[PDB]
């Protein structure tokens, strides 16, 4: 049950119904599958009836097909899809925010054309390329270089854990192209790489601790030749729709945090009023009973934060520390709330015949993508610093 | 500077602001010496000049005069008054919600018209009178005795912990009437007593460890009369309208953490960039920084949690394991918060002259007051329990 | 390098220094794929050297081949084998605390003579059975029946969750010979049951989260015929072997989160200075230095804490809630620290070719095996309850 | 009991009994007054008594009266006297440790044989000078000029929160004798000053939150000659005796959070059983049950953790990083467990009428006082650094 005391409108609380039952009987069963074999195979299939629902390109302008809606309803697909599924849900917070988000606001009309329309309709996938094995969290300090040869720019170097690399027709690359420029960060631009260019090539999928089934491989560029036309805003002004993009990133991805958390709290809760211990049903004692509390209320808390915050951002109101806040705090609780869970299936939680022991594998990853929590801190801190 | 980002209207952010400029100057530089001198000297003035800023009676009906508002406008203003003094937030809370708030949910035509008036201009200060010292988190089982002789009950025994106790012209005090009842619950009966009934005494204040300056007394009944026109509801009757004002004062107690937290930042923020140490301001270094981003992060969640919980409340949608649980989370906080601000102080937050130490010694009081903790979880895990 | 500050004498550094350079070797190396495959297949040939090196009977009496020391230097082996795979360590324990000790404790001149030899030698794997489906924390509530036909038992049912389960060639059962004993507790029986034995079979290893390539199975039991002279102790009386067993049980294993705390450590210190970031090696940062810190004092302090009430343990005073409160508390410690090696690593302690992530997995066994966080808490609140 | 299990001697166990059974008579019941009156009425007279027990010169050489034993001792004395007040253990370790240590290491045989046999009596007072206004945590930017005047030095400038400041007929002080030192810890000179030296005054005792009944004062001087001959150690070699006692101070001191630690238990664990709640003793109920293990194993790690380390110190081997980790540790501890009595207690915790607050109150200053938390973390990631 999922108490709308969050404060969502009709339409809201039907489109929550509508992913929900879909994501219900489409792929909450085949999740331990996915996360099991480390691979989504339906994938390509799966995509297009997200394009179907009209929640890939669930922020786009209707003109491109998108539904035209805001972000506190991204973060309600985002957080029933990872309530589903880890894995997806990420795959899909990096095709529709990272990805399709990135081109409705900084591409031109031509490159929305071009690519917008196939991305929101789930027959292209879409991914982000900014973090090398020697910049994750130091991401300024990039090194793929990217030479200007008349009307085209040959991309040499690589780019490291991409998530849906190797499945993306489309993606936005940052790379350096004034190696020399005073303060680094005037020394980038972004590119839209394609699958197919000449140079560009993906490595093997990682084989990660969670998140399994959400593609992630190294990407390689060998003279690979961008036609000036890719540039995604302006060249070496692309440190900022990378910044700009960040918070969006951590605001739409905190959705992956709240629907773990209630994943939880859907096998806890239940079982805790059915396995019987000492003669009654564990969840009758009070440590249990504190557990619940506990899960619960961090789950209730973080809820409202992303929400209000998410809402605010439809209005106008956007802000880096609020960004960063609200999946800082989330992260971390549904690390903790996971963490929970296994303990109250006790040895049952404990394997991986239940998805108890995938919750928590899967929640450690927000504690480190899209910005570690000490780069967040670091965020937030420094926001307060500038006042 | 409060981002109301947490979706309050134009009038609300109204409210707030008529609040904060009026508590800055009349409460805010008296509170030091009200927690000093465990004493409010200007209570009886300070009240008729809530009463006349519509504050008092907030949730009451404008037909007695009161502001007819909602809880989230309640919260608004508990948070701000507690902001400006934790002692005075405890006090006014008692006297807008467990007192007032009760008598216009229970209280006929009659009652409301005799009392109300006086409570919602401030020339009368409520109580509300529940806890003995033996039955504190184990209300039930209170043995304050009600017998009936005629139209009239002798009250009987004693009161203990009452907040506004020796100022109260009116209290709502609950008693056992019928001491054999099967289920103890379906014994006890509110009666409004008032200041002056023979056998009505009342105790010195106590010397507490915080919220100093809030009068809390033992309240002692020795053959005292009460009409039976005083009850408030009906008789054997009362345990409901002690459950059902709990979650009410859970809900709207729980501003008090949130002025707290926010007074605390109020006080670290600017601190950390005007101290200096090794050469830079102390809020450069990153464990400062982190300590900004979780105080903040926990003040920004635990005010989305109650604001929503509030909103939701006011459209009657009111449950006693929500109710619980915002204010189970948001006392928690508040006192973890108020550590750091010490903290963040160094020796300066260790000593009287500075309000640091005063936050941590109110905040705790929320873990207690309105049902400790433990019972707090005990009630939210029985809420899953009966599902 | 291991500070012995923790009061070791030279003869016990020694036995560190012994088993670190030999499983440095020989087991270390196969620990990531032992996990990955969920199996050891080095097992028998380990045990025997394991044997060789004195470590299965270390506290069993040189009579029988064994090395006749006491428990702190027990833990020591427990952990440094638990700092070269968490799995082996567990397997360790089992055999050589839970059957072996169980044993030199309760068996008879005959048994001891019979079983220890070979256990103490690795040739024989031992296991300890009393954990049912519906019988885990509620151990009392076992329902394997033991029908006595002569000088024979007949056991009929099951067992659940045993360590070592389809390897061990001499298993301690214990089953419940008085079903209708007045209190429960008196109707239980210890026996030793043996590999091959008719009746006595077991199912299929499980899948679990962490401690892969220790073998978990179920024992099935239907007529199994137990000769009289294989019960542990006496008839009845096994409510007894099995409590006082588990006290040494929560002690012993105590070095399994000493060892994983050490593991993490081994990797992350070394790590956060070869990682740079922003130009520094990350264990520049103060959040970083923080986090060696919490992870350092962490570790030394359970390891003091577990080491003391050992070394007490082997001057004959142990107790029920030190046991139980020296397990609580490091393996709470240990999964913690596991949780910010991860971290640590960033996006490297989040794939399986970096331990990190198995760290984790295996640690939080610690708070689930031995007696869940819960029921240890109940312990130590009780044996004050009885004070 | 303190259950010895943490490995004390025979006599080290006496020496615990005979502090305790002086304590409980000389100075507990007197506590609560104490910290009320912010003033310790007999301190002259209490320092004599603890000279009587030759607890004062507990580390010093025999030869000046002194009881010549080590550290470990020391902080058993300093634990109990905590447990009996947490202002008076402060005052002790400043005068034990912070002064004598300090002159029975760093002082010559004239200096040792004029100051130690007064201060080990208690016929003098001694206190450690280094902190000023703007140099807590950053102590080598302290800015007390000492102008060498041929065979004298001319203080100017004060110093800040000096425990017996007010008291002390003897104190260490730390001045700059080279204000122009390349590295300015190349500028530092220990002095020490007795009570009536032309141009050394004091100001008043501070109103500070907890330790009340410890006076903490400002020091001035004003042209205080002080002799050539008084300095300690040697001129601008002092960054290095004031660096040295501090890892002393740290190991020492941490025995104050391990006696407030054992004062809580001493209270909650009796309460726990006598207060009844719902038809039984509150202990009985499992949140209850929980906090008592937590509160227990909390005070048990770090009496294991600062026991060890002390035991080691006196074979000779000591660490900054093992000093300053066994402090960090425990002080928070103790200030979280203080946080739990006052929860066990209900409304009877938050009455200044109990000591419960008290607990908080003098803890808190543990994570401050001889460095905070913060440099604490510094000095551990930094020993980390380094090698
Ligand atoms: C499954 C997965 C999916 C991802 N998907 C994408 C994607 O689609 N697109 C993309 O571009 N990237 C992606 N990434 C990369 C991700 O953004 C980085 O891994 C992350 O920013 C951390 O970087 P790092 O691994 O380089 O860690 P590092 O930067 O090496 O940091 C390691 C540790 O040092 C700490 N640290 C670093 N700097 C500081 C500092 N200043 N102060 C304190 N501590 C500090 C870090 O917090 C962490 O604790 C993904 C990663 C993973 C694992
Ligand atoms: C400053 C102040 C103001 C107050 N103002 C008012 C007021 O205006 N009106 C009013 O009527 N009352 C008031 N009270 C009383 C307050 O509601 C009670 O003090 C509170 O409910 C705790 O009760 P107690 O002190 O009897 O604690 P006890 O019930 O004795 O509880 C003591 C400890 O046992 C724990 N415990 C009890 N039962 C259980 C259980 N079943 N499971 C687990 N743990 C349990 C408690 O949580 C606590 O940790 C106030 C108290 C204070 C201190
Ligand atoms: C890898 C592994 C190895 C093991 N090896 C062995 C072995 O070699 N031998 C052996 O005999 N057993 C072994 N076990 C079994 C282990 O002892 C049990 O799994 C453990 O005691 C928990 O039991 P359970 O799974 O039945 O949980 P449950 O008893 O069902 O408990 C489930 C949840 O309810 C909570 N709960 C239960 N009772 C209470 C209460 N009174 N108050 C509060 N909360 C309560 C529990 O703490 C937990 O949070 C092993 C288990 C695992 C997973
Ligand atoms: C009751 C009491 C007794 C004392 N007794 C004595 C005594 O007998 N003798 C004596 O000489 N002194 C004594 N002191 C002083 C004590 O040593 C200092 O108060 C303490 O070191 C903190 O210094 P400060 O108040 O200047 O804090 P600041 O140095 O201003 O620090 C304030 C905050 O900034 C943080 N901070 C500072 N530097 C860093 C950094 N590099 N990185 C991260 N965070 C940082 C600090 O940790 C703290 O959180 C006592 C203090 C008190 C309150
Ligand atoms: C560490 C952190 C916070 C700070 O970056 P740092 O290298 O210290 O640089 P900053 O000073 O913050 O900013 C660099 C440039 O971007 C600009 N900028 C920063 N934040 C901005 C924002 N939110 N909007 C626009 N511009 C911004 C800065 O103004 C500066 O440009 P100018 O020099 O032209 O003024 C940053 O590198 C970061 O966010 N790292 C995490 C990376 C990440 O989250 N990756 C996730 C990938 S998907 S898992
Ligand atoms: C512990 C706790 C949660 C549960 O009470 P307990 O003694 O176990 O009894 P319960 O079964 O919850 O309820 C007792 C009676 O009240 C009724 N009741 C409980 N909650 C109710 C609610 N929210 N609305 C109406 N009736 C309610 C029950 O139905 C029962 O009545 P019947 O027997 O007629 O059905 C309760 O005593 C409590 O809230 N204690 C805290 C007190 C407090 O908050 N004091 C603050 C004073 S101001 S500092
Ligand atoms: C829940 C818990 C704590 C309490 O058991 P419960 O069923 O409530 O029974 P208890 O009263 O504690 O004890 C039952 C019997 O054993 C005895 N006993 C209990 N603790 C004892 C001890 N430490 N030493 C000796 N005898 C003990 C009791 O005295 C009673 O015997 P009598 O009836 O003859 O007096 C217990 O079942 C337990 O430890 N469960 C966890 C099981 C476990 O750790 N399994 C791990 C397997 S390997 S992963
Ligand atoms: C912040 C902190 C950790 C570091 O000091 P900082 O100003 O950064 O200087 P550092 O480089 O650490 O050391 C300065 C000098 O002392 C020396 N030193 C540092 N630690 C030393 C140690 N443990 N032993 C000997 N010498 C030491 C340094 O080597 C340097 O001398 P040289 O320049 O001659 O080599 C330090 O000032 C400190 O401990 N502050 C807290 C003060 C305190 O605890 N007061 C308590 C009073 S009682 S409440």
């Given at each position: 049950v999922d108490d709308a005391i969050n404060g969502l409108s009709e339409e809201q609380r039907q489109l929550r119904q509508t992913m929900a039952k879909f994501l219900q009987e489409h792929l909450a069963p085949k999740a331990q599958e996915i996360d099991r074999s480390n691979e989504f195979k339906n994938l390509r299939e799966f995509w297009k009836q997200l394009g179907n629902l009209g929640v890939l390109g669930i922020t786009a302008p209707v003109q491109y097909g998108g539904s035209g809606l805001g972000y506190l309803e991204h973060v309600l697909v985002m957080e029933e899809i990872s309530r589903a599924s880890g894995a997806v849900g990420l795959s899909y917070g990096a095709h529709s925010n990272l990805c399709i988000n990135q081109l409705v606001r900084n591409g031109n009309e031509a490159q929305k054309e071009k690519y917008l329309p196939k991305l929101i309709s789930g027959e292209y996938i879409g991914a982000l390329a900014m973090s090398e094995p020697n910049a994750?969290?130091?991401?300024?300090?990039?090194?793929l270089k990217a030479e200007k040869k008349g009307n085209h720019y040959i991309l040499n170097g690589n780019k490291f854990w991409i998530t849906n690399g190797p499945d993306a027709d489309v993606l936005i690359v940052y790379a350096k192209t004034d190696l020399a420029a005073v303060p680094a960060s005037r020394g980038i631009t972004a590119f839209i790489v394609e699958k197919g260019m000449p140079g560009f090539s993906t490595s093997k999928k990682l084989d990660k601790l969670?998140?399994?089934?959400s593609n992630t491989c190294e990407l390689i560029f060998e003279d690979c030749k961008i036609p000036?036309?890719?540039?995604?805003?302006?060249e070496n002004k692309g440190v900022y729709v990378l910044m700009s993009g960040l918070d969006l990133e951590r605001l739409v991805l905190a959705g992956g945090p709240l629907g773990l958390m209630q994943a939880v709290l859907d096998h806890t809760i239940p079982y805790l009023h059915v396995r019987e211990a000492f003669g009654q049903k564990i969840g009758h004692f009070q440590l249990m009973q504190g557990k619940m509390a506990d899960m619960y209320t961090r789950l209730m808390a973080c809820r409202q934060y992303v929400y209000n915050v998410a809402k605010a951002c439809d209005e106008g109101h956007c802000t880096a520390k609020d960004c960063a806040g609200v999946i800082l705090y989330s992260a971390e609780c549904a690390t903790q709330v996971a963490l929970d869970g296994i303990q109250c299936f006790g040895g049952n939680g404990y394997?991986?015949?239940?998805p108890m022991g995938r919750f928590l594998r899967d929640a450690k990853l927000y504690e480190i993508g899209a910005g570690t929590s000490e780069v967040r801190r670091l965020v937030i801190g420094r926001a307060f610093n500038a006042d």
């Open positions: 994750g969290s130091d991401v300024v300090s990039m090194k969670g998140m399994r089934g000036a036309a890719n540039i995604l805003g302006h394997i991986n015949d239940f």
